[PDB]
From Swiss-Prot, chain A:
Region ranges (Immunodominant HLA epitope recognized by the CD8+): 150-158
Domain of life: Viruses
Impact after mutating A340V: In strain: 19B/501Y
Known outcome of mutating S77F: In strain: Omicron/BA.1, Omicron/BA.2, Omicron/BA.2.12.1, Omicron/BA.2.75, Omicron/BA.4, Omicron/BA.5, Omicron/BQ.1.1, Omicron/XBB.1.5, Omicron/EG.5.1
Gene: S
Protein name: Spike protein S1
Substitution effect: N203Y: Increased binding affinity to human ACE2
Reported impact of E186K: In strain: Beta/B.1.351, Eta/B.1.525, Theta/P.3, Iota/B.1.526, B.1.1.318, Gamma/P.1, Zeta/P.2 and Mu/B.1.621; May enhance affinity to human ACE2 receptor
Disulphide linkage map: C38-C63, C81-C134, C93-C227, C182-C190, C240-C292, C319-C336, C349-C358
Outcome reported for the amino acid change (mutating S73F): In strain: Omicron/BA.2, Omicron/BA.2.12.1, Omicron/BA.2.75, Omicron/BA.4, Omicron/BA.5, Omicron/BQ.1.1, Omicron/XBB.1.5, Omicron/EG.5.1
UniProt-reported outcome of changing R110S: In strain: Omicron/BA.2, Omicron/BA.2.12.1, Omicron/BA.2.75, Omicron/BA.4, Omicron/BA.5, Omicron/BQ.1.1, Omicron/XBB.1.5, Omicron/EG.5.1
Result, substituting K119N: In strain: Beta/B.1.351, Omicron/BA.1, Omicron/BA.2, Omicron/BA.2.12.1, Omicron/BA.2.75, Omicron/BA.4, Omicron/BA.5, Omicron/BQ.1.1, Omicron/XBB.1.5, Omicron/EG.5.1; May enhance affinity to human ACE2 receptor
Impact when changing F188V: In strain: Omicron/BA.4, Omicron/BA.5, Omicron/BQ.1.1
Amino acid sequence: TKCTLKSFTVEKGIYQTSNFRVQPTESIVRFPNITNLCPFGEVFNATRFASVYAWNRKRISNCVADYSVLYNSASFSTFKCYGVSPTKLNDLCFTNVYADSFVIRGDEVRQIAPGQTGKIADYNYKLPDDFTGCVIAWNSNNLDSKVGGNYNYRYRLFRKSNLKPFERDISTEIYQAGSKPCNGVEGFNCYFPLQSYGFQPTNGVGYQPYRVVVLSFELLHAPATVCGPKKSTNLVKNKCVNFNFNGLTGTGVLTESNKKFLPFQQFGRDIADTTDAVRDPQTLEILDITPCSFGGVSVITPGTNTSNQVAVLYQGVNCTEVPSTGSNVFQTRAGCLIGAEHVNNSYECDIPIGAGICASYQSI
Amino acid sequence: QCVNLRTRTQLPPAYTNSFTRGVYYPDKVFRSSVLHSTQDLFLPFFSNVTWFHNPVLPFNDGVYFASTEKSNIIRGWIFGTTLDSKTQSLLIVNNATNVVIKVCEFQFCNDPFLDVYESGVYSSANNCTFEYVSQPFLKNLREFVFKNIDGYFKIYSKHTPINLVRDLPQGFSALEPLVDLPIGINITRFQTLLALHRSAAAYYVGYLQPRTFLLKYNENGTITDAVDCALDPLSE
Ligand SMILES: *[C@@H]1O[C@H](CO)[C@@H](O[C@@H]2O[C@H](CO)[C@@H](O)[C@H](O)[C@H]2NC(C)=O)[C@H](O)[C@H]1NC(C)=O
Ligand SMILES: *[C@@H]1O[C@H](CO)[C@@H](O[C@@H]2O[C@H](CO)[C@@H](O)[C@H](O)[C@H]2NC(C)=O)[C@H](O)[C@H]1NC(C)=O
Ligand SMILES: *[C@@H]1O[C@H](CO)[C@@H](O[C@@H]2O[C@H](CO)[C@@H](O)[C@H](O)[C@H]2NC(C)=O)[C@H](O)[C@H]1NC(C)=O
Ligand SMILES: *[C@@H]1O[C@H](CO)[C@@H](O[C@@H]2O[C@H](CO)[C@@H](O)[C@H](O)[C@H]2NC(C)=O)[C@H](O)[C@H]1NC(C)=O
Ligand SMILES: *[C@@H]1O[C@H](CO)[C@@H](O[C@@H]2O[C@H](CO)[C@@H](O)[C@H](O)[C@H]2NC(C)=O)[C@H](O)[C@H]1NC(C)=O
Ligand SMILES: *[C@@H]1O[C@H](CO)[C@@H](O)[C@H](O)[C@H]1NC(C)=O
Ligand SMILES: *[C@@H]1O[C@H](CO)[C@@H](O)[C@H](O)[C@H]1NC(C)=O
Ligand SMILES: *[C@@H]1O[C@H](CO)[C@@H](O)[C@H](O)[C@H]1NC(C)=O
Ligand SMILES: *[C@@H]1O[C@H](CO)[C@@H](O)[C@H](O)[C@H]1NC(C)=O
Ligand SMILES: *[C@@H]1O[C@H](CO)[C@@H](O)[C@H](O)[C@H]1NC(C)=O
């Protein structure tokens, strides 16, 4: 009171000093039950993977993909995310995903990277330097390699030109090394571009088969459809908390409501565009939002001359959240009042309070 | 499998008064016993809409489609710009079991229709992007509103048991939202699909324009009345 009044003495009366508001306690988030998980089981755990020059292409769109489970998987020898960080891939996402799956030797895994050239990197598959996405590779000696000779796997060895980024070549034309034409039969200057692999269970490290899948994320102006889930949590009631219900943020206390939403609305507002009720995405029930209480504070004093004991009034605040004990606490139509006694007599009004009641000094 | 017929499907292109039909919920916000003014695309009151008793018609901003359907002859819709594989084509069919929605570069014939003894009106189906299957949409009146904004296709629908003879009845009924599509296409024309057996089809078409409307919400949150503000001075 002395601070606001800027004096060392205070005249008898009632003064307004400051405000008071209930602080939020914790935060909660709500999100639907999730659905349409992305099918990585039939891609990464596929029984058969095609050749390097004929890599299998898979389109991923309109599903939800959890990157944490594959990030924590230790069954993959190499997991390199170049365009984006692997941890934040669950949040950021693109409009579609393209998966290129194939099998190569262990020594050829380094060629599958931006800014890399080689036999595989130029004759079978080419990766652009501006590529964004991830590459996941793991050994498949126990599966792809064959005791009798894994000749089913082939790699392109001969071509006049290189490969375009994200270009697949399946032509089996007899390459002509020299200037001597060949009538479909390989000769001195003609050889088969495709060479069969020689994978065996025991063939040395580096020569063993390795399954490599490259995921490229594209963000064409079409809406994004595939990325990580939103982690929901439980809800509380009768507590001033902040919330982000399905992207709609607000602070207040949440109670049960009897309003009957029609089966397709999500939230309601009464007038002047203020949200009142929301529908939780999981339980599908209508709640009610009320801003948690606030109001001004005031001090009643009998004057510095007479004494120096005061009373405190909180305006329009229920006598439930005062903080703190002081003296007996009175609840009045004007708010709550601490530090004064209530009597059944009736005198004249000295320091008006409100709602037909006021206080004086005798104690106060 | 698709060949042209002998007789032309010359349906009489007459005109009929729109009265007060073609009002839908503009959002998903609940409001109780309140009057709200909103500016959006709508079908102006008492307009003259086209009546057919199967050419290619422009899409424009939006389309209001109505069918006084008996025994479910109307089956689907086709949307696109070039109506071939050179541009994305949207196909919707409600067959006997479920609705199928496709977004592919099809190759349609001159006069596609469903045919009975599935889909053979397209000679090719390549580069498919979006597929969808859901519950079927369908002496009844079937009303639909088709809109396309910033790569989003909105379909609203309403079914009504009607007993009037010829034209749209004098009554009010809001259109609830039905389906949304997060696909980006620039459709400019469309078509109607009939399952005509190898051996008298009437519907109503109207267009949409931007304007302001006033809507009334009752206590339960249902739209019960509306007023067009770009009309006679009393309404304004
Ligand atoms: C979201 O998932 C929860 C979890 O299953 C669903 O809650 C279930 O609702 C049924 C319906 O009575 C109960 O029998 C189960 O006991 C509930 N599971 C619980 C409480 O863990 C909820 O219905 C789902 N919401 C949807 C699908 O909209
Ligand atoms: C301050 O809050 C308390 C607690 O919510 C209110 O007490 C409730 O009042 C209602 C209305 O009569 C009763 O139905 C409840 O049974 C009461 N609960 C308890 C625990 O007593 C109190 O009414 C509020 N103050 C004012 C002025 O309304
Ligand atoms: C109506 O269309 C649905 C949707 O395509 C058909 O249901 C599918 O039919 C195919 C071929 O019979 C099956 O391979 C799918 O498994 C079916 N899907 C579902 C969800 O049932 C249905 O057969 C069509 N009916 C008619 C009469 O044409
Ligand atoms: C056939 O599909 C391919 C991709 O599956 C389309 O290629 C896209 O073409 C657009 C045109 O500018 C590019 O912006 C995209 O980057 C391309 N790749 C995508 C979307 O992955 C091709 O356009 C399709 N063919 C037709 C006729 O639409
Ligand atoms: C709004 O909702 C209320 C509550 O459901 C409806 O009131 C019901 O009306 C039916 C038939 O008119 C009665 O059989 C019920 O007993 C009523 N229930 C209650 C709680 O009143 C009301 O009809 C709905 N429509 C309007 C315009 O109020
Ligand atoms: C492949 O199968 C193993 C064994 O069940 C599993 O741990 C792994 O998550 C699966 N990977 C994918 C991509 O489904
Ligand atoms: C209070 O006021 C009286 C005059 O009414 C004065 O005599 C007295 O000294 C004052 N006491 C103080 C200022 O403490
Ligand atoms: C009188 O005051 C006392 C305490 O001051 C209170 O308990 C009581 O309810 C009041 N009224 C009557 C009729 O005693
Ligand atoms: C019918 O439509 C025509 C448009 O060609 C219009 O000029 C005419 O006024 C309409 N008739 C009405 C509204 O009664
Ligand atoms: C549709 O064509 C218009 C023609 O200018 C173009 O601006 C627009 O980007 C196209 N949209 C799609 C989705 O093809």
